[PDB]
């Protein structure tokens, strides 16, 4: 059963993690037309999902020159994480989402927008997540229940999730990308801020659990800007998410593969959804 720490540090799943469980969540390749023409995803459904039951929702955007079925493929195995991460009670049982950034005029710093207006309505208008409708109303009061993260490539699309849709998403995972908007570190930690004034938010309402690996280039733009972010009085650092909303976790000897890459999703993701979930859990 889970419980915050202050400061959790990097931890592989177990190596049977990688391996297929008895317990396997349904991944359902999608197909659907949007902003950018027509495209596809694959969603992860968890084992025993009941759509009469709410989800908490996660989704989570590949590398360059990655697409919508590397995180599910041999390359990767997410999907067995999950599966055995959630069967253990590590983590709560969650639909995972993974979308991409490919095709028409799409690109991994525009995403933002057809996740918007076509991504969402899409997915959770089929499957059971917190939102009661797919309005822009209906998925704003669902947020806290709505996560998005990715590496890389994928990092840099979060990051421009973060600062377009804070009305949308309470929870961000950027691994091993930075945000590219400013010419220095203090640009861009202002300019989340401003998203964040902008938003109306407190500082209770939304998180970020940044990752990366110490032999990850990513390391080398994203410290800087992390450091930015640590003074800003919008960030309260800490990964007890009871307490504050703002960690930055980085792996001891981890290079820039999703090796190493699916495992700071199995520390992250369990520190997702708890505050003001609807359960009544303590951790």
């Known amino acids: 059963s889970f419980k915050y720490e202050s400061a959790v540090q990097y931890r592989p799943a177990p190596d049977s993690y990688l391996n297929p469980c008895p317990q396997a969540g349904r991944i359902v390749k999608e197909t659907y037309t949007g902003i950018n023409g027509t495209k596809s995803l694959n969603v992860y459904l968890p084992y025993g999902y009941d759509p009469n039951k709410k989800y908490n929702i996660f989704y989570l955007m590949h590398g360059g020159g990655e697409n919508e079925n590397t995180i599910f493929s041999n390359d990767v195995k997410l999907q067995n994480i999950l599966d055995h991460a959630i069967m253990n009670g590590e983590l709560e049982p969650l639909i995972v989402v993974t979308p991409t950034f490919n095709g028409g005029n799409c690109t991994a710093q525009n995403f933002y927008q057809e996740f918007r207006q076509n991504v969402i309505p899409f997915v959770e208008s089929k499957y059971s997540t917190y939102a009661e409708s797919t309005t822009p109303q209906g998925i704003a009061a669902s947020r806290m229940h709505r996560g998005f993260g ?134």
Not at 172 to 201: C, H, T, V
Not at 232 to 254: E, I, M, Q, R, W
Not at 271 to 281: A, P, R, V
Request: glycine share 8%.
């Open 150 to 283: 990715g590496f890389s490539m994928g990092g840099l699309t979060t990051w421009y999730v973060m600062v377009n849709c804070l009305d949308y998403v309470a929870y961000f995972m950027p691994l091993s990308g930075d945000y590219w908007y400013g010419n220095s570190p203090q640009d861009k930690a202002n300019s989340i801020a401003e998203a964040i004034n902008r938003s109306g938010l407190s500082k209770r309402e939304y998180f970020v659990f940044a990752a990366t690996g110490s032999e990850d280039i990513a390391y080398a733009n994203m410290n800087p800007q992390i450091e930015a972010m640590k003074a800003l009085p919008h960030f309260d650092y800490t990964s007890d998410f009871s307490k504050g909303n703002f960690y930055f976790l980085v792996a001891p000897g981890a290079t820039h593969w999703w090796g190493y890459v699916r495992h700071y999703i199995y520390d992250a993701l369990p520190y997702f959804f708890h505050e003001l979930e609807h359960h009544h859990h303590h951790h």
